[PDB]
Amino acid sequence: MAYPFQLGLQDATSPIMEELMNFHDHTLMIVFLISSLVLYIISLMLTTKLTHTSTMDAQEVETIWTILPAVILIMIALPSLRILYMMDEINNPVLTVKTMGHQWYWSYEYTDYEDLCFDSYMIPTNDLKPGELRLLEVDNRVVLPMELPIRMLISSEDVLHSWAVPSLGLKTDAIPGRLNQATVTSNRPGLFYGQCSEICGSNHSFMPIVLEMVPLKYFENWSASMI
C-alpha cells in the first residue's frame, strides 16, 4: 500500500516481489546508464566550433554499433526470462480461494471443505470509522494464512476486471468464462491493499481488495467463526 511522496515501488512481502524489485533496480540502473550516454553525447557534440561537413565513410563503425545494444539487451533479458520462469513452478498449494468479480464488487469462495462465500464492497467515505483509509477499506476483509502456498483462481461473472494486489506482486485478469490462476504466499502478517486495474464501468475506481494475512490457527478460528 502507498504512502505520500512515494517514488519507488511498494516494498515486498512475497518472494516474487523481492526478485521483481531487484530486477527493477537492475533495469533502472541500465536505463540511467544509457540515458546518461545519450544526454552526455547530445550535450557534448553540439558544443564545438570545429566543423566537418564533407563526405564520410558510411560503414566503418557498425559492428560495435550493433553488438553493444544487443549485448545489453541480452543482459537485460536473461534475468527477465529467469524470473519469468520463476512464476510457473510446481506450486503444491495449501488453500484454494476463488474470486469472482461481480458488477462492481468482489465475491470470495473458500470451498475446499465446508463451502464458505461472501461479498466485498467498499466502506463508503461518509461511513468510515476513524483512522481508516479512504477508497481502500472493505466490508469483509479477505483472510488468508501466511507463509503458505495458496492457489487463487480468479474469474468474473459479466465483464473484464483485474484482481490486483501490488505489495504481494499479484495482478491477474478476471475474464468471464475463463478461470485464471495465481499463487500467493507471504512472509509478514497484516493488511495488503489493492484495487481493480481493468475498466469495468461507472464505479471502476470503487472496488478495492484487502488481503488480511494471519497465522494458520487464527485462520482456522476465522473459518469456523464465519460459517
Binding site: M1, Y3, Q10, D11, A12, T51, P130, G131, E132, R188
Partner: protein, 144 residues
C-alpha cells in the same frame, strides 16, 4: 524595389560560415566610383589604401566572420517570456482553485491524518524501508 517572380531560380548571396565564398556578389549594380575602384583593381594592390580595401570588401560581402558569430542576447528574453507565461499559468490556477474546485474530502484534516498515521504504524504498513521503517517502535518517536 520589387523584383519579379523569379526570386527562387537565380542564386542568392547566402551568408554563413559553412559557405565562405558565396556565388553571388552582394552589391550587384555599382556606382561610378566603384567602377573606378574595379578599374584600379587590375593593377597591383600596393597602391590600395585602407578605405578602398574595406569598402570593396563591403561591396563583395556583407559581414565578416567576426560580425556573424557575435554573441547576441536572445536567450535571456526567450526565458523571460517563458517565466512570464508560466506565471500567468499560475494565476490561472489560482483562479481555478478559488472558483472551479470545491471542498477537499474530510480525510485530510489533522486529527484524521493523525489517527491514519497511527493505524499505518500500528499495522506496520510497508515496514522494510518505506514508512514504518522510519519510526522507533521502542521510543515511540520518529527516527533521527
Amino acid at each position: 524595389s520589387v523584383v519579379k517572380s523569379e526570386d527562387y531560380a537565380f542564386p542568392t548571396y547566402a551568408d554563413r560560415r559553412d559557405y565562405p565564398l558565396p556565388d553571388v556578389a552582394h552589391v550587384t549594380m555599382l556606382s561610378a566610383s566603384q567602377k573606378a575602384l574595379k578599374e584600379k583593381e587590375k593593377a597591383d594592390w600596393s597602391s590600395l589604401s585602407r578605405d578602398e580595401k574595406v569598402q570593396l570588401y563591403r561591396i563583395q560581402f556583407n559581414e565578416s566572420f567576426a560580425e556573424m558569430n557575435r554573441g547576441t542576447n536572445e536567450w535571456k528574453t526567450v526565458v523571460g517570456m517563458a517565466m512570464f507565461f508560466i506565471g500567468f499559468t499560475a494565476l490561472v490556477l489560482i483562479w481555478e482553485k478559488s472558483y472551479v474546485y470545491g471542498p477537499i474530502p474530510h480525510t485530510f484534516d489533522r486529527d484524521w491524518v493523525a489517527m491514519q498515521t497511527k493505524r499505518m504504524l500500528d499495522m506496520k504498513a510497508n515496514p522494510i524501508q518505506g514508512f514504518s521503517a522510519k519510526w522507533d517502535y521502542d521510543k515511540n518517536e520518529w527516527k533521527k
